Amino acid sequence: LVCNPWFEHVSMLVIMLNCVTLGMFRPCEDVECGSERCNILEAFDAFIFAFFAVEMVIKMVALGLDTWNRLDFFIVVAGMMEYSLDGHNVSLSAIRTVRVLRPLRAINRVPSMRILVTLLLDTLPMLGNVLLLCFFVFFIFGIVGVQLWAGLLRNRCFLDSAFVRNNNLTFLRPYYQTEEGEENPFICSSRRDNGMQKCSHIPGRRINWNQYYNVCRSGDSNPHNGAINFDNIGYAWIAIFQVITLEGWVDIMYYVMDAHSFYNFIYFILLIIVGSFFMINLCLVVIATQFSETRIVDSKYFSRGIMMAILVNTLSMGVEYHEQPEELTNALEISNIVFTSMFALEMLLKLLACGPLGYIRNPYNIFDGIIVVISVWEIVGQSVLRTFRLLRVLKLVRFLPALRRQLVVLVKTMDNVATFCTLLMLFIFIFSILGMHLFGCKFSPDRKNFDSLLWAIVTVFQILTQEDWNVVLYNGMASTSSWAALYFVALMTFGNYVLFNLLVAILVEGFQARFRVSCQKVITHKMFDHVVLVFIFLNCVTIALERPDIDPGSTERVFLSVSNYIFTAIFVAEMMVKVVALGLLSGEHAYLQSSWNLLDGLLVLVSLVDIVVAMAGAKILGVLRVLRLLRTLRPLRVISRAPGLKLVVETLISSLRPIGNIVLICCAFFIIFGILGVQLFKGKFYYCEGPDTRNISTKAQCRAAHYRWVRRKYNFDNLGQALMSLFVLSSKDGWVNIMYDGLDAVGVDQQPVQNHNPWMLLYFISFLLIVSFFVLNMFVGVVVENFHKCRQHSPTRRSIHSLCTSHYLDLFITFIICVNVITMSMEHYNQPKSLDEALKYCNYVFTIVFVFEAALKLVAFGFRRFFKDRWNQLDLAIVLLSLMGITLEEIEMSAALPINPTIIRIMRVLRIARVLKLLKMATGMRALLDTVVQALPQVGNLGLLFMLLFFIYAALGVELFGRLECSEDNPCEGLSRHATFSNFGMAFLTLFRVSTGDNWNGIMKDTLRECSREDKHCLSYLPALSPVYFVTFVLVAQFVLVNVVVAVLMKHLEES
Ligand SMILES: CCCCCCCCCCCCCCC(=O)OC[C@H](COP(=O)(O)OCCN)OC(=O)CCCCCCCCCCCCCC
Ligand SMILES: CC(C)CCC[C@@H](C)[C@H]1CC[C@H]2[C@@H]3CC=C4C[C@@H](OC(=O)CCC(=O)O)CC[C@]4(C)[C@H]3CC[C@]12C
Ligand SMILES: CC(C)CCC[C@@H](C)[C@H]1CC[C@H]2[C@@H]3CC=C4C[C@@H](OC(=O)CCC(=O)O)CC[C@]4(C)[C@H]3CC[C@]12C
Ligand SMILES: CC(C)CCC[C@@H](C)[C@H]1CC[C@H]2[C@@H]3CC=C4C[C@@H](OC(=O)CCC(=O)O)CC[C@]4(C)[C@H]3CC[C@]12C
Ligand SMILES: CC(C)CCC[C@@H](C)[C@H]1CC[C@H]2[C@@H]3CC=C4C[C@@H](OC(=O)CCC(=O)O)CC[C@]4(C)[C@H]3CC[C@]12C
């Protein structure tokens, strides 16, 4: 019965039959239970439960009263409760949700999955230290947010009560709201605050009703049907968790910048660093560390000749585009006819030399044979085979040993990854059917729905990639309840911060197992670099003041022009003195013998050319524009002057070498999928744009209806457009909307139809899975190389003293503070007055209790001894700060009111420093923080290179996108009043958003859109520089952040 192993196979057979039974559920076709298909299914489910109950009885009898065994016991108990409770209509369907745990049974039946889960479950206990840090991040930022912005997102511009009453008119809506409605609320800034958005910014009517919305008072709803707000701690954590995932965090920021203050970006800049970057990357480091702790034919020319033929053929296949000329299509076919013949000529020649058996011996020779038959078949059969012509690129593996070796390493990576991927699909499946039960046809139908298995799986995969996952969250919260946020918190946490970090650990552990003399003296002088470095810094301020809105006649323009001449002369002399002392190139130690010296050569040379062009009253405007762009690279001279920056930059360029092949393999897949995407989707990404297009089906109908026939910014018309669309997909920002266009595509001059070709999911989801696999191997290749580089390198007083030295006092304080944390979290918007008095009294008790501790501490140790320890100093500061806070509150209560109410609010917010005391108790967390501290010297410079990169691109963006404008005639999808390149300060903040990858694809769209005919000073070739601007910044910015994660990882490994 149980002894025979075949019984386990019988159980595994039933398990799979239960998973298919769960997947056939239809949310609101089975709830009624009026169909015959459901009746057979529920009977099938009942039969399966009988088997499980029968088996469990047998096992219990055989074995009596193994964690997995307990789990199976839990499922049987839960199922019996659901099964036996039938006949009671009270929450019967709700109890039905417990069956989604049945697929978990398969973990124990598969030995490989059981081992991995066991290893995973033995790694969790040491993640607690990172969990304690998460509590601090959420509690600290969740109580400060509530204190500042409680109820400020309910603000709306209302009509004056007297106006409506006296004038006896009630046709207008009570408060201003765009025609879009509550989906885009117009939040105003209260009169006592200084928010950016005021009720006087309301656009006029388009005699004017809008101008009378001139009162900003609290409304009756928060943004997104109440989902986004800071009215209490519960609603604040939903916002904070959304910021930590870097999805929609700008929208939350803009909501408080428009209502409270523009300087609220500090609150979100810190949170993206402390929480989104370090806290989410400390979890990765901990898991990885813990896992580690647990005759003619053979001629060279012939091979080169055949290699060249394949390469030229591949280049030819990528020259197709929409509206292709007939002649170019004919030429391509002839070229295909010749090339396939050439391979066939090679196919015959090798056969003769080695014979039919000899040729079959070589494995590559076998593959070539499979390609010739289909190639000739296509000509003889004179379109599906056309898509197979891309396989010819695989022939090049024969003649690239370096890549051939690299591919083998990647292929051998699948043996270890196979067990995990099987664990991913089970994790996704359980949450796919769990989503159906909760959100089954409640989203009234949105494309992101849980209405069926196919589109519930896609909505769970999409959430894990964190693309529009908040849009799904808002619908889920509104439909069922605000507590539906727990579904997304668990899916995003167990999926992205535990399972994904486990995959990285699997990979890492797998791999891991006379005047000239004066110049000679002056340049060699110690302070020469610091003197020049000062001039360069002043040159950065001049660059940072440049912006489009400078009046040419103003004094500031004159000042900027003069300073430019001064710096150009200064750096010419510095270059001139160096060359004289060292010689241009003839000497062995010549000036141009080092790349850094060469770098300074081009920058100076451009400056002289700039002077000449400025000297020239001629048609040289185009040249003057290019020069203006290159003059933003001047800050690059800081690297050669700072020894720390020079070292790290040379290190980063070193880290690229080990992963060079993977980049080449990754660049090869971009072209192959780009060429494939062009063939499938060229000419089909057009749509009819208009208020109502339900009747439109073709281009002509779009013209007849006087609607516009337009094109998507990201399409696959040609390999140039395909590569720009694929990079956006790989970045996983806006990748969903490109997928929708692929599914909806119908044909040339045809209106796309929703979900026309669902089979296209394979093209897009396959690309994301493959590209994410290569990106993982770039991170591992950097780590493995770094590890290699690292391994090679009085009686009344005595009792008081006993109490203070005893742990009792410390644990008592930790209890008092833990109570304080609870009370501080009880505050919310419009709390009852009785609560205000109760919380005020609770503050009094804490204040005196802290005071007593300081009094006892002073007596036990003495005034000089007590002040020695920094922890005691922190107590003194907070107790002193607490006394100031409470003092001003009472004066505010008193008749005298000289205290500005900003002071009171700031003091209340700052009283959260009491939590820092718990830091002393958390020895584990402090050691974890100590790891980052020890790595600061290696991370501090990478932060200097990060800000230097930001400066060069923030100054470059202003020159490029300085003048772009947003208007109802030329609307912008990513830019707004908050995201602009108007000046250096704003471009710096926009680039910070781009680094996080929050709707950076929308910003790029706004630069690719054509300038208006009437508008002037629009760069013709901007749509070509914009993709280069965003691609390079995105890749360069992320590489620096990757190395900062690795630097902390190495330090952690070497400390344990
Ligand atoms: C340390 C935090 C780390 C994780 C944080 C992730 C985000 C947590 C979000 C999950 C909780 C979801 C509930 C959100 C909420 O406050 O709304 C519930 C409720 C409103 O929903 P009704 O359907 O009842 O609508 C009533 C309308 N009249 O809000 C309330 O009215 C009060 C709810 C209790 C206040 C929150 C205290 C508990 C903290 C949040 C729970 C999550 C814990 C996360 C660890
Ligand atoms: C990268 C390797 C593997 C293959 C080489 C790729 C090229 C063949 C691609 C890259 C850029 C592509 C071009 C990008 C833009 C255009 C313009 C497009 O429209 C025009 O001819 C514009 C006419 C006008 O401006 O009036 C026609 C296709 C073409 C030449 C594309 C044809 C295919 C090109 C040359
Ligand atoms: C190390 C480098 C980056 C030098 C330090 C940075 C400064 C050069 C930047 C940061 C703050 C910037 C300022 C932020 C805000 C403004 C207001 C803004 O004013 C306008 O454009 C006009 C506004 C109006 O007319 O209402 C743009 C210029 C200025 C002074 C910016 C000029 C450039 C500043 C001084
Ligand atoms: C291989 C992976 C990592 C991507 C590499 C970066 C690409 C996304 C960049 C590199 C060069 C870019 C191309 C440079 C120039 C053009 C031509 C441009 O067409 C025009 O010239 C239209 C504007 C005009 O009217 O001048 C359209 C975008 C495109 C194909 C760019 C699309 C984005 C490209 C392919
Ligand atoms: C560590 C903490 C999270 C545990 C203890 C927290 C509770 C004591 C606090 C947290 C926030 C408070 C809630 C914040 C907001 C509301 C809504 C308020 O009005 C409503 O019920 C309407 C809700 C709406 O319209 O949005 C009633 C009090 C209540 C439940 C508060 C009661 C006390 C709560 C649950």
Ligand SMILES: C[C@@H](NC(=O)Cc1ccc(C2CC2)cc1)c1ccc(OCC(F)(F)F)cn1
């Ligand atoms: C999205 C995420 N990427 C990273 O963390 C760096 C990283 C990339 C890739 C891997 C491995 C698994 C493949 C591991 C780590 C981020 C970016 C930018 C940001 O903000 C920037 C700042 F605000 F600091 F300027 C916060 N998180």
Ligand SMILES: [Ca+2]
């Ligand atoms: Ca996004």
